Design a protein around this ligand. Structure first.
Ligand SMILES: CCCCC/C=C\C/C=C\CCCCCCCC(=O)OC[C@H](COP(=O)([O-])OCC[N+](C)(C)C)OC(=O)CCCCCCC/C=C\C/C=C\CCCCC
Length: 203
């Protein structure tokens, strides 16, 4: 994870670039919006998350975004989650619960935080990216997501919470039913952001 990449995760935090392509909104909740951009040739999507979360310190949100022990405790979709050091870098293992019949997806990835000061503005950036380890091969029954990259930026909203900007992408290695995106858009994520807000109140 280079310097530049961290800097790059701050751009849309101030100003949302979405005009270059067909980003369509998909969700608005708790003052958070999710845009998605379909890659017509692969059926694959990219997501962008903007918004605010009052009632949750930028600095809280960051620490919690990093706390696996805690995440395992409050996040209902985590089936398994743990960290190990490999070389000098932290490697995260995360298995996500999928609505059966669908098999869960699990991730092996590098995750790194950096609290920045961009012109006196104190921001928090976390980038994630896929990696592989010979000791951690694929598990039968679970779908290993081999392509995954994410970035997230947290600034205060000046008031009680924090404004964020998240960029997301992975190849779930199998079709994702529209119904699941519909459950996700309309109930899944809305309820998540809530438990998370609430999990932030009880740190
Ligand atoms: C809004 C419209 C919905 C769009 C469709 C989304 C998903 C459809 C595909 C599969 C859904 C199956 C059910 C899974 C439960 C989803 C409920 C939820 O809502 O699960 C939050 C969570 C954020 O994962 P994570 O970033 O915490 O770490 C993630 C690390 N690993 C990637 C390794 C897991 O979703 C995930 O993993 C799944 C990957 C999708 C993430 C893309 C949008 C992000 C949605 C919510 C996050 C937005 C704001 C909160 C984030 C912090 C605020 C600064």
């Amino acid at each position: 994870f280079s310097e530049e990449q961290f800097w790059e995760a701050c751009a849309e935090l101030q100003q949302p670039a979405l005009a270059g392509a067909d980003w369509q909104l998909l969700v608005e909740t708790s003052g958070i919006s999710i845009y998605r951009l379909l890659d017509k040739k692969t059926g694959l999507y990219e997501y962008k998350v903007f918004g605010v979360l009052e009632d949750c310190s930028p600095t809280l949100l960051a620490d919690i975004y990093m706390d696996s022990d805690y995440r395992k405790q409050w996040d209902q979709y985590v089936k398994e989650l743990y960290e190990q050091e490999c070389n000098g870098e932290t490697v995260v293992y995360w298995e996500v619960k999928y609505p059966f019949p669908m098999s869960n997806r699990d991730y092996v990835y590098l995750r790194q935080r950096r609290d920045l000061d961009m012109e006196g503005r104190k921001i928090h950036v976390i980038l994630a990216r896929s990696t592989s380890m010979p000791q951690l091969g694929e598990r039968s029954g679970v779908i290993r997501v081999k392509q995954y990259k994410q970035s997230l930026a947290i600034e205060s909203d000046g008031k009680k919470g924090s404004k964020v900007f998240m960029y997301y992408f992975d190849n779930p290695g199998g079709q994702i039913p529209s119904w699941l995106i519909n459950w996700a858009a309309k109930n899944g994520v809305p309820n998540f952001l809530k438990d998370m807000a609430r999990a932030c109140q009880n740190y």
